Amino acid sequence: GPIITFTHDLTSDFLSSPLKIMKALPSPVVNDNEQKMKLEAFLQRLLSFDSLLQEVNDAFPNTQLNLNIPVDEHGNTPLHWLTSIANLELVKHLVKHGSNRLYGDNMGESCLVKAVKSVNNYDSGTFEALLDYLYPCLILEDSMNRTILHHIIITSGMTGCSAAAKYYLDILMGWIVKKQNRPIQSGKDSILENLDLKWIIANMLNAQDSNGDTCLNIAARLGNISIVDALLDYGADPFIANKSGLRPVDFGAG
Amino acid sequence: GPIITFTHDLTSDFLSSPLKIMKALPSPVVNDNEQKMKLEAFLQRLLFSFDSLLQEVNDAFPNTQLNLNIPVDEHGNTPLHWLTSIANLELVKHLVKHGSNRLYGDNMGESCLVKAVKSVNNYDSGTFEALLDYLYPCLILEDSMNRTILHHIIITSGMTGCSAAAKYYLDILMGWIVKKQNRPIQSGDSILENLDLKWIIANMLNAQDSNGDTCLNIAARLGNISIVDALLDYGADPFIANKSGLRPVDFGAG
């Protein structure tokens, strides 16, 4: 199928310069308490979209709807909320109507990270479909310089056999290969165009977080052999040591 | 080798009377929010000398006392659940020796030992048998679904790539029960003493959960013949029906 693309948040230098890992945008700090009021109203309305939208825009005609404002104490935006509950329909609507996918919460974690972490609400099939809309987050780094691979490895290594997270790594790499042969359609940008397996190997597979840990180093300590082997297969380097001078081969990986 | 025992968490009276299955203790509703923040801190320092780390965290938090029996996440996981799920045997032993209550269930009433059988970590790491020396008290616990450790092993056997681990867990558990009979016990037990082969057969092997299913009945429905035969060979009764009149023999098991 075609990939429903959006461009309202893919611009500036995050969609032209040679694609690289970037920090998630700081949680928005919108002063106008009126915009926070109109949105609070809109969210309650949820619990068709175009109809509910036309309503709140006529009820609060003075200020425009701003979905890009933190809605709880963790810095979650409306998009983080909807993503954590696996509501793909609403996620696509919010993104369609302004939700900036590059925003991190208090910890600089994107909504895709929130998806990865909410192992109770996602399916293997559901996660892959989510990528069509949140692929821009694949290049985001959080407050601990952790990438989406660090989180997938952390979550899968610490969760069980009944959690869908055990499949996210292979699904993500599969999605990258598959979108190479897919057409786009409004609802290719620099990410869909340059993010390939070559790019993953050079910028993500061996990236190091605040502790110098590559996701392979973390996997080597969690004790799930299949995760370690998967990473080695894709090409993870077992000799990159962290800040404690420990490497993956120190744990028998490689 | 000898079984090093602890009783800080084994004071209850039901533990004195004839040994019987018990519900895991309810997830503690910790009040002191700062104790949690401290525990959360100490926990991250472990994941990323046990005694040094102990004095180290007490200094950073000279204001609050360290309490190891506080849920650390949304699901009611205590530090023991996290560390056991990851097969970190060494840290589990240190936490037990330092007061961690092994009887606490998570929000589902799942004990820390249950985490050991819901992930492949303890099989891959070959720490399961040694883990039982420190977590055997959990063997008598049932969760909010009246599911025992055996129900969970079987549930896991059905998950892709976890068939080997569950077979391993089941056999190690049975062997452990029969081999401990010839093992010295030094305090580093009413349960340890009353926990033997006939107790397992009479109280766990054919125990029924809330649906009235025995682990054998859950296994017959999964279709995985490997663990069905192992259970039958241990004497699992294929005629015990659930709350649907369904019995394992109805699925061709036994």
Side-chain angles (χ1 to χ4, degrees), chain A residues 130-175:
Chain A
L130 183 68
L131 291 173
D132 287 356
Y133 309 100
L134 303 186
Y135 65 78
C137 313
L138 295 173
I139 73 171
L140 304 183
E141 178 178 52
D142 71 6
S143 298
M144 274 187 69
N145 289 77
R146 280 175 172 180
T147 69
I148 191 62
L149 289 194
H150 287 98
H151 286 99
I152 289 167
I153 271 50
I154 290 168
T155 299
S156 64
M158 300 182 77
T159 313
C161 288
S162 69
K166 62 193 278 184
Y167 301 121
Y168 296 171
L169 180 57
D170 291 349
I171 283 169
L172 169 55
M173 303 299 288
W175 180 94

mmCIF file of all heavy atoms in Angstrom, chain A residues 130-175:
data_model
loop_
_atom_site.group_PDB
_atom_site.id
_atom_site.type_symbol
_atom_site.label_atom_id
_atom_site.label_comp_id
_atom_site.label_asym_id
_atom_site.label_seq_id
_atom_site.Cartn_x
_atom_site.Cartn_y
_atom_site.Cartn_z
ATOM 1 N N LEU A 130 2.099 1.535 12.418
ATOM 2 C CA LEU A 130 2.420 2.801 13.083
ATOM 3 C C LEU A 130 3.621 3.486 12.421
ATOM 4 O O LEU A 130 3.686 4.711 12.347
ATOM 5 C CB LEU A 130 2.724 2.564 14.568
ATOM 6 C CG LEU A 130 3.004 3.821 15.405
ATOM 7 C CD1 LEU A 130 1.745 4.656 15.535
ATOM 8 C CD2 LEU A 130 3.496 3.416 16.772
ATOM 9 N N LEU A 131 4.564 2.688 11.930
ATOM 10 C CA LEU A 131 5.761 3.224 11.291
ATOM 11 C C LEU A 131 5.463 4.082 10.074
ATOM 12 O O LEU A 131 6.214 5.006 9.763
ATOM 13 C CB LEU A 131 6.728 2.087 10.919
ATOM 14 C CG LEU A 131 7.371 1.414 12.139
ATOM 15 C CD1 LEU A 131 8.169 0.191 11.704
ATOM 16 C CD2 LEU A 131 8.274 2.418 12.868
ATOM 17 N N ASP A 132 4.375 3.792 9.371
ATOM 18 C CA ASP A 132 4.041 4.611 8.215
ATOM 19 C C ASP A 132 3.867 6.071 8.634
ATOM 20 O O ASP A 132 4.209 6.974 7.880
ATOM 21 C CB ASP A 132 2.769 4.103 7.537
ATOM 22 C CG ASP A 132 2.997 2.814 6.776
ATOM 23 O OD1 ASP A 132 4.167 2.373 6.727
ATOM 24 O OD2 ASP A 132 2.019 2.242 6.231
ATOM 25 N N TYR A 133 3.353 6.303 9.840
ATOM 26 C CA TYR A 133 3.155 7.669 10.316
ATOM 27 C C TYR A 133 4.250 8.241 11.209
ATOM 28 O O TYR A 133 4.484 9.443 11.183
ATOM 29 C CB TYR A 133 1.839 7.790 11.073
ATOM 30 C CG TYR A 133 0.649 7.257 10.332
ATOM 31 C CD1 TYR A 133 0.148 5.994 10.617
ATOM 32 C CD2 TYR A 133 0.007 8.021 9.364
ATOM 33 C CE1 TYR A 133 -0.970 5.499 9.963
ATOM 34 C CE2 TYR A 133 -1.119 7.535 8.699
ATOM 35 C CZ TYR A 133 -1.599 6.272 9.009
ATOM 36 O OH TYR A 133 -2.715 5.771 8.378
ATOM 37 N N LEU A 134 4.922 7.404 11.994
ATOM 38 C CA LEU A 134 5.953 7.925 12.898
ATOM 39 C C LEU A 134 7.389 7.650 12.517
ATOM 40 O O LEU A 134 8.276 7.743 13.361
ATOM 41 C CB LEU A 134 5.739 7.405 14.316
ATOM 42 C CG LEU A 134 4.388 7.689 14.957
ATOM 43 C CD1 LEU A 134 4.443 7.220 16.400
ATOM 44 C CD2 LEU A 134 4.075 9.184 14.885
ATOM 45 N N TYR A 135 7.635 7.329 11.254
ATOM 46 C CA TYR A 135 9.000 7.059 10.827
ATOM 47 C C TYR A 135 9.962 8.227 11.071
ATOM 48 O O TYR A 135 11.168 8.017 11.177
ATOM 49 C CB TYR A 135 9.021 6.640 9.352
ATOM 50 C CG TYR A 135 8.573 7.711 8.386
ATOM 51 C CD1 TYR A 135 9.427 8.756 8.034
ATOM 52 C CD2 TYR A 135 7.296 7.677 7.823
ATOM 53 C CE1 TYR A 135 9.026 9.747 7.145
ATOM 54 C CE2 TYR A 135 6.880 8.662 6.926
ATOM 55 C CZ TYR A 135 7.755 9.695 6.592
ATOM 56 O OH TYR A 135 7.367 10.661 5.691
ATOM 57 N N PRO A 136 9.451 9.472 11.166
ATOM 58 C CA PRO A 136 10.373 10.591 11.404
ATOM 59 C C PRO A 136 11.097 10.490 12.753
ATOM 60 O O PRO A 136 12.208 10.999 12.918
ATOM 61 C CB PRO A 136 9.456 11.818 11.342
ATOM 62 C CG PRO A 136 8.375 11.382 10.404
ATOM 63 C CD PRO A 136 8.097 9.976 10.868
ATOM 64 N N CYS A 137 10.454 9.838 13.713
ATOM 65 C CA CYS A 137 11.021 9.660 15.047
ATOM 66 C C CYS A 137 12.211 8.712 15.065
ATOM 67 O O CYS A 137 12.980 8.699 16.024
ATOM 68 C CB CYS A 137 9.964 9.110 15.987
ATOM 69 S SG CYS A 137 8.406 9.972 15.886
ATOM 70 N N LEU A 138 12.353 7.911 14.014
ATOM 71 C CA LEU A 138 13.452 6.962 13.944
ATOM 72 C C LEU A 138 14.804 7.659 14.031
ATOM 73 O O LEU A 138 15.792 7.039 14.403
ATOM 74 C CB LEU A 138 13.377 6.138 12.652
ATOM 75 C CG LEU A 138 12.168 5.205 12.481
ATOM 76 C CD1 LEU A 138 12.189 4.629 11.069
ATOM 77 C CD2 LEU A 138 12.190 4.085 13.525
ATOM 78 N N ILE A 139 14.852 8.947 13.705
ATOM 79 C CA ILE A 139 16.120 9.674 13.759
ATOM 80 C C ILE A 139 16.271 10.505 15.026
ATOM 81 O O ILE A 139 17.242 11.242 15.178
ATOM 82 C CB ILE A 139 16.282 10.629 12.565
ATOM 83 C CG1 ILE A 139 15.361 11.838 12.729
ATOM 84 C CG2 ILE A 139 15.953 9.905 11.271
ATOM 85 C CD1 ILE A 139 15.621 12.940 11.680
ATOM 86 N N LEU A 140 15.311 10.389 15.936
ATOM 87 C CA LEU A 140 15.361 11.153 17.169
ATOM 88 C C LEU A 140 16.157 10.472 18.266
ATOM 89 O O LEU A 140 16.170 9.250 18.394
ATOM 90 C CB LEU A 140 13.950 11.444 17.679
ATOM 91 C CG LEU A 140 12.995 12.170 16.726
ATOM 92 C CD1 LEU A 140 11.674 12.417 17.448
ATOM 93 C CD2 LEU A 140 13.608 13.486 16.261
ATOM 94 N N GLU A 141 16.802 11.297 19.072
ATOM 95 C CA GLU A 141 17.629 10.861 20.191
ATOM 96 C C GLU A 141 17.007 11.518 21.435
ATOM 97 O O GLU A 141 16.541 12.654 21.364
ATOM 98 C CB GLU A 141 19.050 11.365 19.935
ATOM 99 C CG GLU A 141 20.073 11.068 20.987
ATOM 100 C CD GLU A 141 21.447 11.576 20.581
ATOM 101 O OE1 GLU A 141 21.548 12.764 20.212
ATOM 102 O OE2 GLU A 141 22.424 10.794 20.627
ATOM 103 N N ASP A 142 16.968 10.811 22.559
ATOM 104 C CA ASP A 142 16.376 11.393 23.755
ATOM 105 C C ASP A 142 17.434 12.007 24.664
ATOM 106 O O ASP A 142 18.592 12.137 24.274
ATOM 107 C CB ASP A 142 15.535 10.361 24.521
ATOM 108 C CG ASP A 142 16.373 9.303 25.210
ATOM 109 O OD1 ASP A 142 17.618 9.411 25.200
ATOM 110 O OD2 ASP A 142 15.781 8.360 25.773
ATOM 111 N N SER A 143 17.024 12.381 25.870
ATOM 112 C CA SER A 143 17.907 13.024 26.838
ATOM 113 C C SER A 143 19.139 12.233 27.258
ATOM 114 O O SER A 143 20.097 12.804 27.780
ATOM 115 C CB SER A 143 17.101 13.434 28.066
ATOM 116 O OG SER A 143 16.102 14.370 27.696
ATOM 117 N N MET A 144 19.117 10.922 27.044
ATOM 118 C CA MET A 144 20.275 10.106 27.376
ATOM 119 C C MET A 144 20.950 9.589 26.113
ATOM 120 O O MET A 144 21.659 8.585 26.136
ATOM 121 C CB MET A 144 19.870 8.958 28.283
ATOM 122 C CG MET A 144 19.882 9.374 29.734
ATOM 123 S SD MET A 144 19.606 8.006 30.812
ATOM 124 C CE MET A 144 21.162 7.082 30.576
ATOM 125 N N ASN A 145 20.739 10.316 25.020
ATOM 126 C CA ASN A 145 21.290 9.971 23.717
ATOM 127 C C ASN A 145 20.924 8.560 23.322
ATOM 128 O O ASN A 145 21.664 7.884 22.615
ATOM 129 C CB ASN A 145 22.804 10.138 23.694
ATOM 130 C CG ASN A 145 23.217 11.587 23.730
ATOM 131 O OD1 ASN A 145 23.185 12.226 24.779
ATOM 132 N ND2 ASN A 145 23.582 12.128 22.572
ATOM 133 N N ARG A 146 19.777 8.111 23.803
ATOM 134 C CA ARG A 146 19.310 6.791 23.453
ATOM 135 C C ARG A 146 18.496 6.945 22.182
ATOM 136 O O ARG A 146 17.790 7.941 22.018
ATOM 137 C CB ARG A 146 18.470 6.205 24.592
ATOM 138 C CG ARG A 146 19.355 5.652 25.686
ATOM 139 C CD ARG A 146 18.613 5.162 26.893
ATOM 140 N NE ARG A 146 19.548 4.488 27.792
ATOM 141 C CZ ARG A 146 19.210 3.939 28.954
ATOM 142 N NH1 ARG A 146 17.952 3.987 29.368
ATOM 143 N NH2 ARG A 146 20.130 3.329 29.694
ATOM 144 N N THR A 147 18.642 5.985 21.273
ATOM 145 C CA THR A 147 17.898 5.986 20.022
ATOM 146 C C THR A 147 16.708 5.041 20.179
ATOM 147 O O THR A 147 16.510 4.463 21.250
ATOM 148 C CB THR A 147 18.740 5.448 18.881
ATOM 149 O OG1 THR A 147 18.964 4.043 19.087
ATOM 150 C CG2 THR A 147 20.062 6.176 18.805
ATOM 151 N N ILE A 148 15.925 4.876 19.109
ATOM 152 C CA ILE A 148 14.771 3.978 19.138
ATOM 153 C C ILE A 148 15.274 2.520 19.240
ATOM 154 O O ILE A 148 14.550 1.639 19.711
ATOM 155 C CB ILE A 148 13.860 4.186 17.866
ATOM 156 C CG1 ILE A 148 12.529 3.444 18.021
ATOM 157 C CG2 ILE A 148 14.580 3.721 16.616
ATOM 158 C CD1 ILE A 148 11.676 3.929 19.195
ATOM 159 N N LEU A 149 16.518 2.256 18.830
ATOM 160 C CA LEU A 149 17.044 0.888 18.950
ATOM 161 C C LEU A 149 17.370 0.589 20.410
ATOM 162 O O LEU A 149 17.120 -0.522 20.894
ATOM 163 C CB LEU A 149 18.294 0.663 18.095
ATOM 164 C CG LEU A 149 18.188 0.586 16.568
ATOM 165 C CD1 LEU A 149 19.503 0.019 16.018
ATOM 166 C CD2 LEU A 149 17.031 -0.308 16.151
ATOM 167 N N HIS A 150 17.925 1.573 21.123
ATOM 168 C CA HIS A 150 18.229 1.376 22.542
ATOM 169 C C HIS A 150 16.946 0.992 23.281
ATOM 170 O O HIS A 150 16.940 0.048 24.073
ATOM 171 C CB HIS A 150 18.797 2.650 23.188
ATOM 172 C CG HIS A 150 20.207 2.966 22.795
ATOM 173 N ND1 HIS A 150 20.519 3.883 21.813
ATOM 174 C CD2 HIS A 150 21.391 2.523 23.285
ATOM 175 C CE1 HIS A 150 21.834 3.996 21.720
ATOM 176 N NE2 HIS A 150 22.388 3.183 22.604
ATOM 177 N N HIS A 151 15.864 1.729 23.030
ATOM 178 C CA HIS A 151 14.591 1.450 23.684
ATOM 179 C C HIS A 151 13.993 0.095 23.306
ATOM 180 O O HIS A 151 13.472 -0.603 24.170
ATOM 181 C CB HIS A 151 13.583 2.575 23.409
ATOM 182 C CG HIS A 151 13.874 3.828 24.173
ATOM 183 N ND1 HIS A 151 14.522 4.912 23.614
ATOM 184 C CD2 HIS A 151 13.695 4.131 25.481
ATOM 185 C CE1 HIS A 151 14.734 5.823 24.546
ATOM 186 N NE2 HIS A 151 14.244 5.375 25.688
ATOM 187 N N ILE A 152 14.056 -0.278 22.027
ATOM 188 C CA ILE A 152 13.542 -1.580 21.610
ATOM 189 C C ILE A 152 14.342 -2.685 22.320
ATOM 190 O O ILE A 152 13.778 -3.644 22.856
ATOM 191 C CB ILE A 152 13.655 -1.760 20.073
ATOM 192 C CG1 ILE A 152 12.643 -0.853 19.370
ATOM 193 C CG2 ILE A 152 13.440 -3.218 19.702
ATOM 194 C CD1 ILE A 152 12.869 -0.724 17.879
ATOM 195 N N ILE A 153 15.662 -2.537 22.344
ATOM 196 C CA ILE A 153 16.489 -3.532 23.002
ATOM 197 C C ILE A 153 16.206 -3.560 24.498
ATOM 198 O O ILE A 153 16.057 -4.627 25.085
ATOM 199 C CB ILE A 153 17.997 -3.278 22.728
ATOM 200 C CG1 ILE A 153 18.419 -4.018 21.452
ATOM 201 C CG2 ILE A 153 18.846 -3.782 23.894
ATOM 202 C CD1 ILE A 153 17.525 -3.779 20.266
ATOM 203 N N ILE A 154 16.108 -2.389 25.116
ATOM 204 C CA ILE A 154 15.841 -2.350 26.549
ATOM 205 C C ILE A 154 14.500 -2.988 26.871
ATOM 206 O O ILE A 154 14.410 -3.857 27.745
ATOM 207 C CB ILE A 154 15.852 -0.893 27.095
ATOM 208 C CG1 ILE A 154 17.287 -0.343 27.074
ATOM 209 C CG2 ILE A 154 15.293 -0.866 28.508
ATOM 210 C CD1 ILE A 154 17.383 1.175 27.326
ATOM 211 N N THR A 155 13.459 -2.567 26.152
ATOM 212 C CA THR A 155 12.121 -3.085 26.401
ATOM 213 C C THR A 155 12.001 -4.588 26.142
ATOM 214 O O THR A 155 11.461 -5.318 26.971
ATOM 215 C CB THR A 155 11.084 -2.341 25.547
ATOM 216 O OG1 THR A 155 11.091 -0.953 25.902
ATOM 217 C CG2 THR A 155 9.687 -2.916 25.773
ATOM 218 N N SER A 156 12.505 -5.059 25.002
ATOM 219 C CA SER A 156 12.406 -6.480 24.697
ATOM 220 C C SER A 156 13.247 -7.319 25.651
ATOM 221 O O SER A 156 12.841 -8.403 26.047
ATOM 222 C CB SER A 156 12.820 -6.757 23.246
ATOM 223 O OG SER A 156 14.189 -6.432 23.034
ATOM 224 N N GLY A 157 14.422 -6.827 26.025
ATOM 225 C CA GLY A 157 15.261 -7.598 26.930
ATOM 226 C C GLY A 157 14.681 -7.766 28.328
ATOM 227 O O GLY A 157 14.934 -8.766 29.004
ATOM 228 N N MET A 158 13.892 -6.787 28.760
ATOM 229 C CA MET A 158 13.294 -6.820 30.091
ATOM 230 C C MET A 158 11.849 -7.264 30.129
ATOM 231 O O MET A 158 11.262 -7.342 31.195
ATOM 232 C CB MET A 158 13.398 -5.455 30.744
ATOM 233 C CG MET A 158 14.820 -4.996 30.904
ATOM 234 S SD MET A 158 14.850 -3.430 31.735
ATOM 235 C CE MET A 158 14.534 -3.998 33.451
ATOM 236 N N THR A 159 11.257 -7.533 28.974
ATOM 237 C CA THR A 159 9.879 -7.997 28.964
ATOM 238 C C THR A 159 9.900 -9.484 28.620
ATOM 239 O O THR A 159 10.945 -10.040 28.284
ATOM 240 C CB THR A 159 9.025 -7.247 27.935
ATOM 241 O OG1 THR A 159 9.255 -5.839 28.054
ATOM 242 C CG2 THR A 159 7.559 -7.499 28.209
ATOM 243 N N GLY A 160 8.747 -10.127 28.690
ATOM 244 C CA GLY A 160 8.710 -11.548 28.410
ATOM 245 C C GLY A 160 8.385 -12.013 27.006
ATOM 246 O O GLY A 160 8.464 -11.267 26.028
ATOM 247 N N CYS A 161 8.021 -13.289 26.940
ATOM 248 C CA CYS A 161 7.667 -13.977 25.715
ATOM 249 C C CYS A 161 6.299 -13.565 25.193
ATOM 250 O O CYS A 161 6.016 -13.710 24.005
ATOM 251 C CB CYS A 161 7.685 -15.484 25.975
ATOM 252 S SG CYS A 161 9.361 -16.173 26.182
ATOM 253 N N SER A 162 5.455 -13.046 26.079
ATOM 254 C CA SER A 162 4.111 -12.636 25.682
ATOM 255 C C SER A 162 4.046 -11.194 25.184
ATOM 256 O O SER A 162 2.979 -10.714 24.792
ATOM 257 C CB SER A 162 3.128 -12.814 26.849
ATOM 258 O OG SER A 162 3.385 -11.877 27.884
ATOM 259 N N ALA A 163 5.176 -10.500 25.192
ATOM 260 C CA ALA A 163 5.187 -9.117 24.738
ATOM 261 C C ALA A 163 5.587 -8.984 23.272
ATOM 262 O O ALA A 163 6.553 -9.609 22.818
ATOM 263 C CB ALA A 163 6.119 -8.304 25.600
ATOM 264 N N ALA A 164 4.846 -8.150 22.547
ATOM 265 C CA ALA A 164 5.093 -7.907 21.128
ATOM 266 C C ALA A 164 6.454 -7.269 20.864
ATOM 267 O O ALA A 164 6.964 -7.353 19.750
ATOM 268 C CB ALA A 164 3.980 -7.031 20.549
ATOM 269 N N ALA A 165 7.046 -6.635 21.878
ATOM 270 C CA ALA A 165 8.361 -5.991 21.720
ATOM 271 C C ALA A 165 9.439 -6.927 21.182
ATOM 272 O O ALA A 165 10.416 -6.485 20.581
ATOM 273 C CB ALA A 165 8.821 -5.396 23.041
ATOM 274 N N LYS A 166 9.271 -8.224 21.407
ATOM 275 C CA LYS A 166 10.236 -9.209 20.924
ATOM 276 C C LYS A 166 10.340 -9.179 19.393
ATOM 277 O O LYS A 166 11.289 -9.710 18.826
ATOM 278 C CB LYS A 166 9.817 -10.621 21.366
ATOM 279 C CG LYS A 166 8.463 -11.050 20.785
ATOM 280 C CD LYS A 166 7.883 -12.298 21.457
ATOM 281 C CE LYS A 166 8.482 -13.579 20.901
ATOM 282 N NZ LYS A 166 7.832 -14.786 21.493
ATOM 283 N N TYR A 167 9.363 -8.560 18.731
ATOM 284 C CA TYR A 167 9.345 -8.512 17.272
ATOM 285 C C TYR A 167 9.682 -7.172 16.636
ATOM 286 O O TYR A 167 9.917 -7.111 15.433
ATOM 287 C CB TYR A 167 7.963 -8.904 16.743
ATOM 288 C CG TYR A 167 7.463 -10.281 17.126
ATOM 289 C CD1 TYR A 167 6.267 -10.430 17.830
ATOM 290 C CD2 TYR A 167 8.139 -11.436 16.724
ATOM 291 C CE1 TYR A 167 5.742 -11.698 18.118
ATOM 292 C CE2 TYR A 167 7.625 -12.718 17.007
ATOM 293 C CZ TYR A 167 6.425 -12.835 17.699
ATOM 294 O OH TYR A 167 5.875 -14.074 17.941
ATOM 295 N N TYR A 168 9.686 -6.105 17.426
ATOM 296 C CA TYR A 168 9.913 -4.764 16.899
ATOM 297 C C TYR A 168 11.186 -4.539 16.086
ATOM 298 O O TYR A 168 11.160 -3.812 15.093
ATOM 299 C CB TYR A 168 9.856 -3.752 18.044
ATOM 300 C CG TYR A 168 8.509 -3.640 18.729
ATOM 301 C CD1 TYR A 168 8.371 -2.896 19.897
ATOM 302 C CD2 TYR A 168 7.377 -4.286 18.222
ATOM 303 C CE1 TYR A 168 7.162 -2.793 20.547
ATOM 304 C CE2 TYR A 168 6.146 -4.188 18.876
ATOM 305 C CZ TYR A 168 6.056 -3.436 20.038
ATOM 306 O OH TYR A 168 4.865 -3.316 20.702
ATOM 307 N N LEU A 169 12.299 -5.139 16.507
ATOM 308 C CA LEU A 169 13.554 -4.962 15.783
ATOM 309 C C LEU A 169 13.444 -5.472 14.349
ATOM 310 O O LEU A 169 13.712 -4.737 13.400
ATOM 311 C CB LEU A 169 14.707 -5.685 16.500
ATOM 312 C CG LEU A 169 16.074 -5.557 15.800
ATOM 313 C CD1 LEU A 169 16.449 -4.079 15.644
ATOM 314 C CD2 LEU A 169 17.139 -6.292 16.598
ATOM 315 N N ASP A 170 13.045 -6.732 14.181
ATOM 316 C CA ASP A 170 12.921 -7.287 12.835
ATOM 317 C C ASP A 170 11.846 -6.568 12.017
ATOM 318 O O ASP A 170 12.001 -6.377 10.815
ATOM 319 C CB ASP A 170 12.653 -8.793 12.897
ATOM 320 C CG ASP A 170 13.864 -9.583 13.401
ATOM 321 O OD1 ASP A 170 14.971 -9.007 13.504
ATOM 322 O OD2 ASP A 170 13.713 -10.789 13.684
ATOM 323 N N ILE A 171 10.764 -6.156 12.661
ATOM 324 C CA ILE A 171 9.717 -5.423 11.950
ATOM 325 C C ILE A 171 10.256 -4.084 11.444
ATOM 326 O O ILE A 171 10.001 -3.689 10.305
ATOM 327 C CB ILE A 171 8.501 -5.165 12.853
ATOM 328 C CG1 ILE A 171 7.677 -6.457 12.987
ATOM 329 C CG2 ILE A 171 7.664 -4.020 12.281
ATOM 330 C CD1 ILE A 171 6.590 -6.406 14.059
ATOM 331 N N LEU A 172 11.008 -3.386 12.286
ATOM 332 C CA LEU A 172 11.575 -2.096 11.888
ATOM 333 C C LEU A 172 12.533 -2.221 10.704
ATOM 334 O O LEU A 172 12.469 -1.431 9.767
ATOM 335 C CB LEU A 172 12.320 -1.452 13.059
ATOM 336 C CG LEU A 172 13.197 -0.228 12.732
ATOM 337 C CD1 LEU A 172 12.374 0.859 12.026
ATOM 338 C CD2 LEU A 172 13.780 0.314 14.020
ATOM 339 N N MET A 173 13.432 -3.200 10.750
ATOM 340 C CA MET A 173 14.379 -3.368 9.654
ATOM 341 C C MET A 173 13.613 -3.816 8.406
ATOM 342 O O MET A 173 13.933 -3.402 7.295
ATOM 343 C CB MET A 173 15.466 -4.383 10.042
ATOM 344 C CG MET A 173 16.240 -3.991 11.324
ATOM 345 S SD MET A 173 17.117 -2.399 11.138
ATOM 346 C CE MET A 173 18.391 -2.910 10.041
ATOM 347 N N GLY A 174 12.593 -4.651 8.595
ATOM 348 C CA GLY A 174 11.793 -5.100 7.464
ATOM 349 C C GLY A 174 11.065 -3.930 6.816
ATOM 350 O O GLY A 174 10.952 -3.831 5.583
ATOM 351 N N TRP A 175 10.565 -3.026 7.648
ATOM 352 C CA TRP A 175 9.847 -1.860 7.153
ATOM 353 C C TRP A 175 10.772 -0.988 6.298
ATOM 354 O O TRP A 175 10.364 -0.450 5.267
ATOM 355 C CB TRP A 175 9.288 -1.049 8.331
ATOM 356 C CG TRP A 175 8.524 0.183 7.915
ATOM 357 C CD1 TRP A 175 7.169 0.296 7.719
ATOM 358 C CD2 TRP A 175 9.075 1.477 7.642
ATOM 359 N NE1 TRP A 175 6.851 1.580 7.345
ATOM 360 C CE2 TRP A 175 8.002 2.324 7.290
ATOM 361 C CE3 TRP A 175 10.376 2.005 7.662
ATOM 362 C CZ2 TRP A 175 8.190 3.674 6.961
ATOM 363 C CZ3 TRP A 175 10.559 3.357 7.334
ATOM 364 C CH2 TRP A 175 9.471 4.169 6.989
#
